[PDB]
From Swiss-Prot, chains A, B:
SUBUNIT field: Homodimer. Interacts (via C-terminus) with VP1 in the cytoplasm. Interacts with VP2.
Compartment(s) where it occurs, according to its Swiss-Prot or TrEMBL record: Virion; Host cytoplasm
Annotated protein name in UniProt: Capsid protein VP3
Lineage: Viruses, Riboviria, Orthornavirae, Birnaviridae, Avibirnavirus
Disulfide bridge positions per record: none
Protein's organism: Avian infectious bursal disease virus (strain PBG-98)
Highest rank taxon of the organism: Viruses
Positions spanned in the full protein: 827 to 955 of 993
Signal sequence residues: none
């Protein structure tokens, strides 16, 4: 049956997308999108806004806009650990990881500039002393 | 001696500021600032940029600009736990807290809008199933 062959296909495409962490791409989202995975614009709209892309929108302005930087809590922790510099490279205090987190928020997902790096290094030195 | 009385005063003001998590306000920063804590503009410049305010700048544009929203990792975890809704209210998977983190970065420290809330709720439901 072309119906079951259609449900399996949507399920297959959706599984592929979610394995990559593309969470909006459910089998129903994929059905609505004409039984195909997201176009470049749909992916980049989602990546940059975290809103579910309309299956019936193409997002042509997000196909060739390229800012797009964001940090997970792992990335934030690796940045904070590098800046803090504790012996045996142990985790920084939570108060420090929070200042680093807020820097990534201020910068829309980008990492600390030079001036911010100085603030963070100043902060780290007070917390170790 | 007015010198020791000056060092104690700077130390006193600085201790007060750092107890509040105002980390740039070292005793040396306080000395340079004419032996006073930060003005409203200096605090708000720091809060909104995370750069050490110049002791010899007043930051008049930051005295009456009021966006200023930011989230610690505690706030992010409380938002993620509320949205995820696991029994006994146990911590969400790290992959979920990371999607919530990235939403706060996209929004410059503000919390998820309605469209983003839908994405996150969709995400939570896939991770529990």
């Amino acid at each position: 049956t072309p119906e079951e062959a259609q449900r399996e296909k949507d399920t297959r495409i959706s599984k592929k997308m979610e394995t990559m962490g593309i969470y909006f791409a459910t089998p129903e989202w994929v059905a609505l999108n004409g039984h195909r995975g997201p176009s470049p614009g749909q992916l980049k709209y989602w990546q940059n806004t975290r809103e579910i892309p309309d299956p019936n929108e193409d997002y042509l302005d997000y196909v060739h806009a390229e800012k797009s930087r964001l940090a997970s809590e792992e990335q934030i922790l690796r940045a904070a650990t590098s800046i803090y510099g504790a012996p045996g490279q142990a985790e920084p205090p939570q108060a420090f990881i929070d200042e680093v987190a807020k820097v990534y928020e201020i910068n829309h997902g980008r990492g600390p500039n030079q001036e911010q790096m100085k603030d963070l290094l100043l902060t780290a030195m007070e917390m170790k002393h």
